[PDB]
Design a protein around this ligand. Structure first.
Ligand code: HEM
Ligand code: HEM
Ligand code: HEM
Ligand code: HEM
Lengths: 141, 146, 141, 146
């Protein structure tokens, strides 16, 4: 359901990010653990302090997933196959939490790319993350 | 809301810097482009069909300014958000029937606009304190529902 | 899309509902208007009082749509293609409100089928209404 | 919450008909069945993997009952839900970290169970009063988040 213009704004945007995706992942994760402390109870097994090797390594995981998702826009469910299963069946991640991380991801992007984070790109990235969220919550449905 | 002494100082310090005529207008504008159903409430504002239309609309700017000032009121009465937002609650809930969820979304939209404006200065820590504030504003405005 | 042994529970339930979908439509609407008064501002043109001609007729349109959705479980995006367009582009229905109508529909079903509305039936109808609501919100993303 | 005298009479009148040891356990069981992520907070309850497992689970039944008595407590103190649920607010928010949306979802599950139990006695008017109660219970338990 992702518009052609939204497909484009997502493509350019992740062309700005690229290898910063891992660095944005970890920052978005800390912003979420600090902004929404309820989300921390899902990672009691990671040191969540700023710059920890675990938050950085997990940030890379998340960033690389979003990178992959950006390249698989007509294919999200299959692209994020192992992940839908994991987040629903195994992790029991509350649907609300994907909105909080999506928000933190937008804050992170805006904070690093003020000139490129136009109202239009903001909108498209919100839609991209909304679709990723949908897919990751889909095994509840 | 409970902000630590350090958090209160950080929040007021950051707010003294926000460009009052710009940030509120940009925050209202982005909400309207990113969440198109909110345009339902602003039908006298004319064209809101595209980002260019919303972001070059004087009534959106004038209204964003008053919205940013209202958040500012909350900043100087963090002790009593309920009483600060009581009449506006009547307006938004009894009169306009805005679903309270949109108060949360506009709060977070202001947060991403603060990030856009301040870059690195808008740290994970400062964001977290601003999350406390916008959550408090939203809930105070939703009081006629709950 | 829904699972098997859940795809089944949907189709059975709509048969166990039968052609009561038009009546349950209008009742769920009234339950929504009364339970969530914000939802009424979308129908200032309709008389919303109990048993009004307009609520009865609109309830029939909502009940019929759900019926058509129930025998299009593999292709809801195409089946509810035009309706998603209407609620987003034309009516600007807030995504939250769909949760509220979905709830009022489960209440209506439960109130009429106390023996049939098992925890499993409940679960599958929720997922069905969730899927319907997602398609009807599709055009915001 | 704002309930009229008629609404108060109708809610209290329906509640004395509520089967105390049955309705709470059915509503908790149903929440755990329908929204599978809620099962993360009830690790000790053992098997919650099927509807038959959840619905024939004595811990789910006992805990449901305590949850229904907590709703009843709120019905006895509709003018002061905040004070009634203050301690439980800290339990659910500070200790367990249950996302507040789940308080609304469980409140709506209770509304569904009551419909199921009472048929056409659970009219549109009566449900609308329980929607006010259920919203107030949720918001009062969420007070620790603002
Ligand atoms: C944009 C949304 C998200 C994406 C793209 C994403 C992606 C991922 C990825 C790639 C993994 C790694 C699995 C592996 O190692 O093979 C993972 C695991 C995990 N996710 Fe997420 N995730 C998202 C949202 C969330 C949210 C909102 C939460 C909860 C607040 C969450 C909780 C977890 C946990 C607890 C793990 C396992 C960590 C470990 O022990 O390795 N995720 N996710
Ligand atoms: C974030 C919390 C919000 C604050 C602090 C806020 C602030 C205000 C203020 C101060 C006014 C009065 C303006 C005046 O006196 O001219 C107002 C009115 C109004 N609000 Fe908000 N607002 C908020 C959220 C929202 C949202 C989310 C919506 C809809 C999606 C909305 C819709 C309106 C409308 C339609 C008016 C009347 C505009 C007019 O006069 O034409 N508000 N608000
Ligand atoms: C289960 C989810 C829903 C379904 C299946 C549904 C179904 C429909 C259908 C089939 C129509 C076509 C009416 C026509 O032929 O003119 C319609 C129109 C409409 N819907 Fe929905 N709807 C749903 C949710 C909602 C919600 C949550 C709202 C907002 C409270 C809403 C507001 C409206 C309005 C205002 C119209 C136009 C009414 C008119 O003037 O004819 N709908 N809907
Ligand atoms: C209307 C909202 C709710 C009310 C009134 C309520 C009520 C209660 C009460 C009275 C207790 C203490 C029982 C005792 O002393 O043994 C309790 C504990 C607990 N609550 Fe809730 N609850 C609500 C919602 C929720 C939700 C939505 C969840 C998670 C999905 C949850 C998870 C828990 C857990 C895990 C415990 C402790 C479990 C144990 O000790 O075995 N509650 N609740």
């Amino acid at each position: 359901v992702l518009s052609s213009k939204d497909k484009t704004n997502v493509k350019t945007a992740f062309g700005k990010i690229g290898g910063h995706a891992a660095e944005y992942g970890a920052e978005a994760l800390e912003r979420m653990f600090l902004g929404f402390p309820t989300t921390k109870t899902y990672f009691p097994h990671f040191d969540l302090s700023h710059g920890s090797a675990q938050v950085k390594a997990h940030g890379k995981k998340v960033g690389d997933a979003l990178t992959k998702a950006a390249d698989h826009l007509d294919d999200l469910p299959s692209a994020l196959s192992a992940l839908s299963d994991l987040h629903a069946h195994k992790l029991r991640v509350d649907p609300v939490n994907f909105k909080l991380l999506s928000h933190c991801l937008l804050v992170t992007v805006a904070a690093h790319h003020p000139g490129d984070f136009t109202p239009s790109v903001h909108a498209s990235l919100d839609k991209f993350l909304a679709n990723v969220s949908t897919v990751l919550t889909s095994k509840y449905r | 809301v409970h902000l630590s002494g350090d958090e209160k100082n950080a929040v007021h310090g950051l707010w003294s810097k926000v460009k009052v005529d710009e940030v509120g207008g940009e925050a209202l504008g982005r909400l309207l482009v990113v969440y198109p159903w909110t345009r339902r409430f602003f039908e006298s504002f004319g064209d809101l069909s595209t980002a260019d239309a919303v972001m070059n609309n004087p009534k959106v700017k004038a209204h964003g300014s008053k919205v940013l000032n209202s958040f500012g009121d909350g900043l100087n009465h963090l002790d009593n958000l309920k009483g600060t937002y009581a009449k506006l609650s009547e307006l938004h809930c009894d009169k306009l029937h805005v679903d309270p969820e949109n108060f949360r979304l506009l709060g977070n939209v202001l947060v991403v606009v603060l990030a856009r404006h301040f870059g690195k200065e808008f740290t994970p820590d400062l964001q977290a304190a601003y999350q406390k504030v916008v959550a408090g504003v939203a809930n105070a405005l939703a009081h006629r529902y709950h």
